[PDB]
Amino acid sequence: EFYGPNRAKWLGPYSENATPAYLTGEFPGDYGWDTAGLSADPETFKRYRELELIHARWAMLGALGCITPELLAKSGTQFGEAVWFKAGAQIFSEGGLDYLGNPSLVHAQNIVATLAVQVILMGLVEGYRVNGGPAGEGLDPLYPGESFDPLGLADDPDTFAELKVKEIKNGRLAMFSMFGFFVQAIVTGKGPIQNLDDHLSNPTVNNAFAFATKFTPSA
């Protein structure tokens, strides 16, 4: 499974004609879901694959960077502010942005200098993604290797393709989780592990349907 014409598909047993003919099983996670036909052209398919994997890895990094201060708030450190949709306000505090609640570790003051250093590093490392650099030169722009794999888990090509489909499946689940974090931050106003604590406190009232009313206009 997971590659070829007899692979795992998005409808499963009901997925023998709805899958498009141009989604042949060579690329990872090709579950055959192009119901709007946007990746019919091969250049659109390649660019959307690049966008999907980069969005995937940014989403899983964002998922861990959002939930790990919540798990450490469960663990016992206080940081500057644990809530991820209130985490940017640590640099607006009086003590600044302490990293792990340690005032002698980051202690950031200027948000403008943070954005300047952030864009000066990120523009360089995002432009290095396109056309090689100190890490690589002319590799696969989605799977470079040889400088970002110090352990090098890409040795056997069958296990390499297995890790590819595992990565893209964890990535679709990660963008799913980050979209959930986005639309349950705005309707609840509490952190996501805190929403897990509400849903584990009473599972039948602390749902999305407790807050399913608040977005009516009402003049």
Partner 1 sequence: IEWYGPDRPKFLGPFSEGDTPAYLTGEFPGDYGWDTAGLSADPETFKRYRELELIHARWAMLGALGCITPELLAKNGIPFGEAVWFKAGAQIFAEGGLNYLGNENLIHAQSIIATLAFQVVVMGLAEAYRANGGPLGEGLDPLHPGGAFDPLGLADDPDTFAELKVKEIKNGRLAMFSMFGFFVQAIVTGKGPIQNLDDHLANPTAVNAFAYATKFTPSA
Partner 2 sequence: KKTIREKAGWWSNGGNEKLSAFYGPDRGLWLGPLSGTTPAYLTGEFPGDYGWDSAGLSADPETFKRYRELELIHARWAMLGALGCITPELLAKNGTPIVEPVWFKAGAQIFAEGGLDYLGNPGLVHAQSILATLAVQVILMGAIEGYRVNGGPAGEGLDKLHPGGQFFDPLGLAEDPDAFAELKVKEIKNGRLAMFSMFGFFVQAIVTGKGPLANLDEHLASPFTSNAFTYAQKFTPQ
Binding site for ligand CHL (CB under 6 A): 8-14, 31, 84-89, 111, 114-115, 118-119, 123, 127, 172, 185, 209, 212-213, 215-216
Identify which of 178, 190, 173 has the alpha carbon closest to the alpha carbon of residue 208: 190
- Tracing tokens 């360089």 back to the chain, one arrives at 124
**Residue 8 to residue 173: CA distance in whole angstroms:** 16
**Residue 102 to residue 98: CA distance in whole angstroms:** 5
**Using CB under 8 A as the criterion, which residues of the chain lie in contact with partner 1 when the complex forms?**
11, 14-18, 20, 22, 34-38, 40-41, 204, 207, 209, 212-213, 216-219
**Residue 102 marked in a binding site:** no
- Tracing tokens 């040795």 back to the chain, one arrives at 155
Residue 44 as a binder of partner 2 (CB under 8 A): the answer is yes
SS3 83: coil
Contact 79, 107 (CB under 8 A): no
Contact 127, 121 (CB under 8 A): no
Q: Which does 31 bind (CB under 5 to 8 A by kind): partner 1, ligand CHL, partner 2, none?
A: ligand CHL
**Residue 185 marked in a binding site:** no
**Residue 126 marked in a binding site:** yes
Q: Which does 18 bind (CB under 5 to 8 A by kind): partner 1, partner 2, ligand CHL, none?
A: partner 1
Measured at the CA of 52, the angle between CA 1 and CA 29, to 5 degrees, comes to 0
Site residues (vs partner 2, CB under 8 A): 41, 43-44, 46-48, 51, 85-86, 88-89, 92, 110-112, 115, 124, 127-128, 130-132, 141, 185-189
* Binding residue ranges for all-trans-violaxanthin: 212, 214-215
